[PDB]
């Protein structure tokens, strides 16, 4: 089977150019197009470009026909997607596809649908700071099913992974997603429900883990 | 170049029932070259159909593609709890390639009405020069629900922001997070803090509210 692994994540600032790049595992790589399709947090799909290796015959979509630049590398089975000119609305995940099959080799009649895709790589825009989340006590209402839980403000870039006593509790947890704040910062509210008549004998801890940042605290949530 | 749109945008069916979801082309798809894709949340699309019609190995006999020229069209037989996700159609006849705007489909449930709670800012936030008021609605479906902010008996707009999760795996509820946000000046110059949520379950709205230091 093919398999595309991508690079990793990474934040830009508002200006600069990024390069992410797209190895292809399996099968050939010389005679099928590969594109790139990124995708905003919470939009849908939207098509870049792409370019058949063995031709060098580059095709880009017109909202990036100034600022994008695709390439292949045959010797490396390598794709490269460079985006100049970078600004916050091109924050999103892109993805490195290829068209699947119907054989293998330099035969097999193409299909032309993205069959094949990579990970995905987040790519930041921001001209904000990696920041570690500050972790706040949400209190249960001293006033069963009473809702307790974490408010993780301010931190940059996504993403963030909450769990509850180190992984302990799961029932009735929701982690909701993150919202963009005017200073640039992200961030987001972990609760869960429990019985009211268990607020003072269990021990309910949020841990925040915060990747980009190297940042995890775990908060002690008690009623007030 | 070519636009497609989708129809409907959110899918409302139960577990078993037939989904038919439609795209409908700016112009004529060259060659007959439209595809469907299905993406989770959190995962990369999966082709699902290629070539309007023809299905990849490995793919669920209960999917099947027909139509052609300007209108095509997805169709799972039976829906089961694995597909209720999100569906794209991408025209690939030429040069220039185009997606559409995908279609969720969702659970269908008895609509519940939402848990209401609010939670003042943190004492350790308030000593660190800002103040979140955060207003939780736990399970409900479906997800339209309204969420206003009232300070002192006065609409507040401009601040607080929402959020809403995705749809449960277990029971097909959503749950909406709202978060005022104001500086601790702004914050100690009033008391009464209510916020008021009106959905479908609800027969009149509820305002859930506290006073600021009680
Ligand atoms: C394998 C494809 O591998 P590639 O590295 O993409 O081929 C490019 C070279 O030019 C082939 O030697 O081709 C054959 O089996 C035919």
């Known amino acids: 089977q093919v398999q595309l692994v991508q690079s990793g994540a990474e934040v830009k600032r508002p200006g600069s150019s990024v390069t992410v790049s797209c190895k292809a595992s399996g099968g050939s790589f010389s005679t099928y197009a590969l594109s790139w399709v990124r995708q905003a947090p919470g939009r849908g799909l939207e098509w870049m470009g792409g370019?058949?290796?063995?031709?060098?015959?580059?095709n880009y979509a017109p909202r990036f026909q100034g600022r994008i630049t695709i390439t292949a590398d045959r010797s490396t089975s390598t794709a490269y997607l460079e985006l100049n000119s970078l600004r916050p609305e091109d924050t999103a995940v892109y993805y490195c596809?290829?068209?699947?099959?119907?054989?293998?080799?330099?035969?097999?009649?193409?299909?032309?649908?993205?069959?094949?895709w990579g990970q995905g790589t987040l790519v930041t825009v921001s001209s904000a700071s990696t920041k570690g989340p500050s972790v706040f006590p949400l209190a249960p209402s001293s006033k069963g099913t009473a809702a307790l839980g974490c408010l993780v403000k301010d931190y940059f870039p996504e993403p963030v992974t909450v769990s509850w006593n180190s992984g302990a509790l799961t029932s009735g947890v929701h982690t909701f997603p993150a919202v963009l704040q005017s200073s640039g910062l992200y961030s987001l509210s972990s609760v869960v429900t429990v019985p009211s008549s268990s607020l003072g004998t269990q021990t309910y801890i949020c841990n925040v883990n915060h990747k980009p940042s190297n940042t995890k605290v775990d908060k002690k949530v008690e009623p007030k | 170049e070519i636009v497609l749109t989708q129809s409907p945008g959110t899918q409302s069916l139960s577990p078993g029932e037939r989904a038919t979801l439609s795209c409908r082309a700016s112009?004529?798809?060259?060659?007959?070259?439209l595809a469907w894709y299905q993406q989770r949340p959190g995962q990369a699309p999966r082709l699902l159909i290629y070539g309007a019609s023809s299905r990849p190995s490995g793919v669920a006999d209960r999917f099947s593609g027909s139509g052609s020229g300007t209108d095509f069209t997805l169709t799972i037989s039976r829906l089961e709890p694995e597909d209720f996700a999100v569906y794209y159609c991408q025209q690939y006849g030429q040069s220039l390639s185009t997606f559409g705007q995908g279609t969720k489909v969702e659970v269908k449930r008895t609509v519940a009405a939402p848990s209401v709670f609010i939670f003042p800012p943190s004492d350790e936030q308030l000593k660190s020069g800002t103040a979140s008021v955060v207003c939780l609605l736990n399970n409900f479906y479906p997800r339209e629900a309204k969420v206003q902010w009232k300070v002192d008996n006065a609409l507040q707009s401009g601040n607080s922001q929402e959020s809403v999760t995705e749809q449960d795996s277990k029971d097909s509820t959503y749950s909406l997070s709202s978060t005022l946000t104001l500086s601790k000046a702004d914050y100690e110059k009033h008391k009464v803090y209510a916020c008021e949520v009106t959905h479908q379950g609800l027969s009149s709205p509820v305002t859930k509210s506290f006073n600021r230091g009680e």
């Open positions: 370019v058949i290796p063995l031709l060098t015959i580059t």
């Open positions: 112009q004529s798809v060259g060659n007959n070259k």
């Open positions: 596809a290829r068209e699947g099959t119907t054989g293998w080799g330099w035969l097999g009649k193409p299909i032309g649908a993205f069959a094949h």
